[PDB]
Design a protein. Structure first.
Ligand code: MG
Ligand code: MG
Ligand code: MG
Ligand code: MG
Ligand code: MG
Ligand code: MG
Ligand code: MG
Ligand code: MG
Ligand code: MG
Ligand code: MG
Ligand code: MG
Ligand code: MG
Ligand code: MG
Ligand code: MG
Ligand code: MG
Ligand code: MG
Ligand code: MG
Ligand code: MG
Ligand code: MG
Lengths: 191, 109, 139, 195
RNA sequence: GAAGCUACCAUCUGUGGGAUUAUGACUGAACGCCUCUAAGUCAGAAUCCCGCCCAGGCGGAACGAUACGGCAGCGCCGCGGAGCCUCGGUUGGCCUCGGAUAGCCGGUCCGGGGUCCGGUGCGGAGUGCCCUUCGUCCUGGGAAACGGGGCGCGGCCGGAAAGGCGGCCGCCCCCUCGCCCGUCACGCACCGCACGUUCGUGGGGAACCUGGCGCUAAACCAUUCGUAGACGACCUGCUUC
RNA sequence: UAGCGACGUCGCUUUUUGAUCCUUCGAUGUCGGCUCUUCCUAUCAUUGUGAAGCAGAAUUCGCCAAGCGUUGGAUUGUUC
RNA sequence: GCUGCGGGAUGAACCGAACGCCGGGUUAAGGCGCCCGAUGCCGACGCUCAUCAGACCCCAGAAAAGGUGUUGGUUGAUAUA
RNA sequence: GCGGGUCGCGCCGUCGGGCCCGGGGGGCCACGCGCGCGUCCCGGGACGGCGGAGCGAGCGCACGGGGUCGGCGGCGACGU
C-alpha cells in the first residue's frame, strides 16, 4: 500500500568496527575481515552513535515484497557480525552402513576426498570454497568439522558434501548413507 | 559574410496513411520543439536550393548550376514544432532529408 | 543520505506549472502524491500541488500542523525567507539564466568583446604559467 | 553532423526508435559500445526469445532466408532494419547512413560521445525490475569475441584515465589564472549579462 | 591376371567447453517460527549454443611485380592553363570511468582514510570556444615577451581496432597592429528586392605544355601434363643443360 | 487420492467415421506397397530426475526432453 | 449485389460516410514509440512480472477447477483484564 | 381542525403600465416662430388635417457600402 520508512535496528558489539562506502558493507573483527555487496537492493543504510555502533536499515515507500526485503539486510548483517567475531562451525557425523566411508583432506584443508562410499570404486574428489577449512575431528567416530567466516560459503561447502554423497537408483528410505550436517554452531564456545 | 537563413530539414508530405497530398509539405525545423515555439516562424519564406548541369540564373551575378524553388510557411503542424509549407511548384520528392532554407524574409517585429 | 526530506513547514520551489519561479511553503501532505502548499508573501494562493511539480530546497520553518495563512505569514516574516533566498547561489543561477534569455543583440556584442578579451588574457597567462611549471620541473 | 552515441545503460527498443527517426532526416548517427546495451525483462526470457528466433529458419535452404546475426552490433542493426522501411529505396540509404560498432574504433576513441536521456535504464526502469546485458546474451549465443572486446575496453579505459588527468591539470592551471587578477574590467559587464 | 575402380565381403578413424531446464540444496524474510524465492547464491543433463569439422559475402587484410626499343609508356612531387560530369553541406569539439537509496571537486597523512567545497548540476554540451571579422589609412590608451603564418628544414614518436592526425625541440625570411578601448577618412554608395557568404587550390573521367625523381612487367590463349576432368574449371612441365 | 476410480461433470484433438456442399465437371491421375527427406510429442528405449503397496532385481506413475533409435519374416492387394 | 472513399494490416457483408473536377478550413469512425501523418503532454490515478505475459465489436483459438503469487472487499473471532 | 376561490392589511422588487401630476447631470431617428384644428391635462404639451409649418440644394466630399485595383516598383542579349 506504499508504506513509509520501515526501519530495522542492528546493534553492533564493542569488538567489531564497521565501515560502509555505500550499499557495500565492510566489517572488520578479530577473526579476519569481511565484506558484502548489497548493490541491487536500493535501501538506505546509515549508522548512528559515537562508539556505541547502532546501525539502522531504512527503506521508504516500497511494496510488500520490499518490506520483506528490508529485514533480509538486517539478518545478513547479523550473520556477518556473528561470523567476524566467532566464525561458523559445522559438525557432520558420517552415517555408514555395512560399508565404511573414508574421508581424507588432500591438500591444505581445502580439498576433501571421499572413498569407498557403499563399495563404489569411484574416488570422489570434491573442491570446497575459498575461505573455509575442513578437519576430521577427534574424540568422535567419523565427525567432520568445517570452520569458516562467511556462512554462505561454509554452508555451500556443506551442501556440496551432502550432494556429493547421494545414492542413485535405490530406495533412499533404506540405504540411508551419506555425510550429513548434524550440528551448526560457533568456533569459540560459550558465546 | 554570415548565414542569414535558419536551417530546416524536409520531413515529407502532408499525408494520411495510404494516400498523400502532394500540394503541401512538412518541415521539421531545428531549434523548434513546441507548438508555442513555432509561432515566430509563421509567414516566413522557404527556399529549396539544388544543382543542375545547365547554366541558368536570376540577378545573382553570373550563370550558375544553382536552381531554387520558392515558397512560404502556412501554419504549424502538430505539437512537435513541425511546420506545414506550400511552394509554388511541388517538391521533387528527392529532397526527403535535405536542407531547406528558411529565410528571415517577412519579419514582423 | 537523503539530507532533505519533506516535513510540515518546509519551503519549496515550483519548477513546472502555473507557478514557475515562485516559492511555496508546504502546509501538510494529503496523500503521497499531492500536498497543500501556500505562499503568504510570494504571491501564491493556498492550493494543492503534486510532489513531482515541486522542487525541494533546504530552508525549514516552524508551523503548527495545518495552520492558517496568518501564522504562515508570521513565521515567514520572522524567518526572513526572501532575502536569505536571494542570497544563495541557486537564485544567482536562476537570475543569470533569466538575464541570458533577456539579452539583446547589443548585449551579445558586448558579451563577445568582453569574452574575447578575457579568453586572451587567460590564454597568455595560462601559457606563461605552464611554461613556468615546465621550467620549475626542469631541474 | 555525426551523432556519436554511447551505449552503456541504454535500452534496445528506445534507442532504436530515436536513432531510426533521426536517421531518416539525414544526421549521420553512429552507435558506439553496442555490447553495453541493456534489454528490459529477465534475461532468461531474453535468451529464450532470441533462441526461438534462432529456431525460426527456412527448411528448404537455410542459406536463403533468415540470417541470424550473432554479433551485438549486428543485433542492434537488425533491430533498426525492422524499424526502417528498408525495402523502399529510402530506408536503404538510411541504413547506409547508419553505422554501428561493437567495441570502440580509433576515431571514436577521441570523438566526443553523446548519451540519449530518453532511453536510459535509469529513467525508464523502476529499480526493482530485472534487466539484461546484450554482451552477456551475445556471449551465450554464438558471438565468440567477448574476451577480445573486454581486453580492448580495459586498454582504452586505461588510456582515457591518462588523458583525463592531463585535462584536469589544464583546468587547475586556468582556475589558478582566474584566481589571479586583471580580468575584472570585463567581469562586471559579464555578470550583468550572464557570466 | 598387371595397373586402375571397388566391398561392413578387406582395413582405418570418429574428439570438449559454457550458460542453464527438470530436480536437489544453502542463506533468508514475507508470517519475530518455518520455508529452495521475495531479493541473493550453488550443484545439475542424450536438450540448447559454441568449440572440433565442411562452404567461404556486392566482406576486409599484408606482401610481391608493377609494361622500351627505336621514340615511347607509366608512376610519386611541384605546378600553373583550359574543359565534361555527380551532388550535398553554409563555424568547429582535441575523449574520464561509473552511480542513481548516490556522485563530483579541492587537500596534511600511509591507491585508501581524515579534511575543505560545490550541488535540481555554473569546474555547467539549456553549456564551451576562433567566433555577430567588411577591409584599409591616420593616430593615441590598455593588453603584450610568447611571436604568429609556413615551401619551411632536420630530429623525436603518440596511436593498433577500422591508425595519418596530434604534439615537442633546434634552426630559418618576415610580423613587435598576429586580440580590446579611442582619433581619423576613404574604399562601387551600382540609387527597395531572390540563386549571397562556405569546409573547395570539393569528388571522378578524358586530354594539353611544364620542371624533378624513378620503373622497364604480368595474365590469358596456343602447347604439355593427369594428383583433375561432361565442357569449362583444376594440378603441372616447357634455362638451350 | 502408491495405482485406479463409478455416479456426474468441463475440455482438447483432426491420425477414425459422420454432417455440409464453400472451391474445381472446357478433368488437380483414385487404393496399397517400394524408395526418400523433414517435422510433431500425446515418451516405447536411451541421458538427468522425483514417487511407489520401490529390500535387491523386475516393474508402474510422473517431469525436463523429439538429439538419436524404433528391425528380419510366414500369410492377405491391403490400411488394419 | 449495382459502390467507390477513411479506419478494422490484410476483407463483399464490419464502423464512419456515400462519389462531377479543384484550392482553403474543420471533423467523423479511428489513432498519436518507429515503419506511418499526430502526445517530442516535465498528462492525472492505480493494477499486474509472465522460464508460453498482454495489447481493442465483427475477429481469426479456450473452459470447469486451484493458488499463504499479490491487490482490494464482505462477514465473524480475538487484543490492553 | 384543515384545505379551494373572493375581499380587505402593510412589506418586497435597477418590477410593469414610454404611465400620471405638479414642483423642487445624462440619454433621444425629436424641431418654423406667428397663434388657431379637435381631444386630453393644469396659457402650455401631444398627435390626424392645416393656422404655423420638413427654409435652400447638391456642392465638395469621406466610405467595414451591386465578388479588387494600383494614377506601385524592380531584374536579364549573343546563348540564354
Ligand atoms: Mg530397483
Ligand atoms: Mg559405410
Ligand atoms: Mg531453482
Ligand atoms: Mg458447390
Ligand atoms: Mg465436395
Ligand atoms: Mg481446368
Ligand atoms: Mg492435368
Ligand atoms: Mg499435377
Ligand atoms: Mg530428428
Ligand atoms: Mg448479378
Ligand atoms: Mg441501392
Ligand atoms: Mg458499401
Ligand atoms: Mg481501405
Ligand atoms: Mg485485424
Ligand atoms: Mg486491400
Ligand atoms: Mg480539402
Ligand atoms: Mg475520435
Ligand atoms: Mg512521426
Ligand atoms: Mg487471488
Amino acid at each position: 500500500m506504499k508504506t513509509i520508512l520501515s526501519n530495522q535496528t542492528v546493534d553492533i558489539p564493542e569488538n567489531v568496527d564497521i565501515t560502509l562506502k555505500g550499499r557495500t558493507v565492510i566489517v572488520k573483527g578479530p577473526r579476519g575481515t569481511l565484506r558484502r555487496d548489497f548493490n541491487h537492493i536500493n535501501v538506505e543504510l546509515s549508522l548512528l552513535g559515537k562508539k556505541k555502533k547502532r546501525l539502522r536499515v531504512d527503506k521508504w515507500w516500497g511494496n510488500r515484497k520490499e518490506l520483506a526485503t528490508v529485514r533480509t539486510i538486517c539478518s545478513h548483517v547479523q550473520n556477518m557480525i556473528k561470523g567476524v567475531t566467532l566464525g561458523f562451525r559445522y559438525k557432520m557425523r558420517s552415517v555408514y552402513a555395512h560399508f565404511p566411508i573414508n574421508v581424507v583432506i588432500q591438500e591444505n584443508g581445502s580439498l576433501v576426498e571421499i572413498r569407498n562410499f557403499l563399495g563404489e570404486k569411484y574416488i570422489r574428489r570434491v573442491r570446497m570454497r575459498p575461505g573455509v577449512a575442513c578437519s576430521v575431528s577427534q574424540a568422535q567416530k567419523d565427525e567432520l568439522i568445517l570452520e569458516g567466516n562467511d556462512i554462505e560459503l561454509v554452508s555451500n561447502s556443506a551442501a556440496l558434501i551432502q550432494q556429493a554423497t547421494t545414492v542413485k537408483n535405490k530406495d533412499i528410505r533404506k540405504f540411508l548413507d551419506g555425510i550429513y550436517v548434524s550440528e551448526k554452531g560457533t568456533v569459540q564456545q560459550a558465546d | 559574410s554570415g548565414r542569414l537563413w535558419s536551417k530546416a530539414i524536409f520531413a515529407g508530405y502532408k499525408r494520411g496513411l495510404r494516400n498523400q497530398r502532394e500540394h503541401t509539405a512538412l518541415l521539421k525545423i531545428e531549434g523548434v520543439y513546441a507548438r508555442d515555439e513555432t509561432e515566430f516562424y509563421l509567414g516566413k519564406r522557404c527556399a529549396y536550393v539544388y544543382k543542375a548541369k545547365n547554366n541558368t540564373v536570376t540577378p545573382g551575378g553570373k550563370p550558375n548550376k544553382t536552381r531554387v524553388i520558392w515558397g512560404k510557411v502556412t501554419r504549424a503542424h502538430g505539437n512537435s514544432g513541425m511546420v506545414r509549407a506550400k511552394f509554388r511548384s511541388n517538391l521533387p520528392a528527392k529532397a526527403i532529408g535535405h536542407r531547406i532554407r528558411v529565410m528571415l524574409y517577412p519579419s514582423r517585429i | 543520505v537523503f539530507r532533505r526530506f519533506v516535513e510540515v513547514g518546509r519551503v519549496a520551489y515550483v519548477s513546472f506549472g502555473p507557478h514557475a519561479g515562485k516559492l511555496v511553503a508546504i502546509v501538510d501532505v494529503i496523500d503521497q502524491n499531492r500536498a497543500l502548499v501556500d505562499g503568504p508573501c510570494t504571491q501564491v494562493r493556498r492550493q494543492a500541488m503534486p510532489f513531482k511539480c515541486m522542487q525541494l530546497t533546504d530552508f525549514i520553518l516552524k508551523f503548527p500542523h495545518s495552520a492558517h495563512q496568518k501564522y504562515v505569514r508570521q513565521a515567514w516574516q520572522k524567518a526572513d525567507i526572501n532575502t536569505k533566498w536571494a542570497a544563495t547561489r541557486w537564485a544567482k543561477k536562476i537570475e543569470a539564466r533569466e538575464r541570458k534569455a533577456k539579452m539583446t543583440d547589443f548585449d551579445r556584442f558586448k558579451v563577445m568583446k568582453a569574452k574575447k578579451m578575457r579568453n586572451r588574457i587567460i590564454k597568455n597567462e595560462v601559457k606563461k604559467l605552464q611554461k613556468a611549471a615546465l621550467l620549475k620541473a626542469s631541474p | 553532423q555525426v551523432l556519436v552515441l554511447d551505449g552503456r545503460g541504454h535500452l534496445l527498443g528506445r534507442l532504436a526508435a530515436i536513432v531510426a527517426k533521426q536517421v531518416l532526416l539525414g544526421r549521420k548517427v553512429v552507435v558506439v559500445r553496442c555490447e553495453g546495451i541493456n534489454i528490459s525483462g529477465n534475461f532468461y526470457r531474453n535468451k529464450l526469445k532470441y533462441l526461438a528466433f534462432l529456431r525460426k529458419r527456412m527448411n528448404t535452404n537455410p542459406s536463403r532466408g533468415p540470417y541470424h546475426f550473432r554479433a551485438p552490433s549486428r543485433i542492434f542493426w537488425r533491430t533498426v532494419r525492422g524499424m526502417l522501411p528498408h525495402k523502399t529505396k529510402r530506408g536503404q540509404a538510411a541504413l547506409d547512413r547508419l553505422k554501428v560498432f561493437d567495441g570502440i574504433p580509433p576515431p571514436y576513441d577521441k570523438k566526443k560521445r553523446m548519451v540519449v536521456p530518453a532511453a536510459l535504464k535509469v529513467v525508464r526502469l523502476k529499480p526493482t525490475r530485472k534487466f539484461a546485458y546484450l554482451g552477456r546474451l551475445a556471449h551465450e549465443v554464438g558471438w565468440k569475441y567477448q574476451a577480445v572486446t573486454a581486453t580492448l575496453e580495459e586498454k582504452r579505459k586505461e588510456k582515457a584515465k591518462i588523458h583525463y588527468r592531463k585535462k584536469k591539470q589544464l583546468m587547475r592551471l586556468r582556475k589558478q589564472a582566474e584566481k589571479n587578477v586583471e580580468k575584472k574590467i570585463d567581469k562586471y559587464t559579464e555578470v550583468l549579462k550572464t557570466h
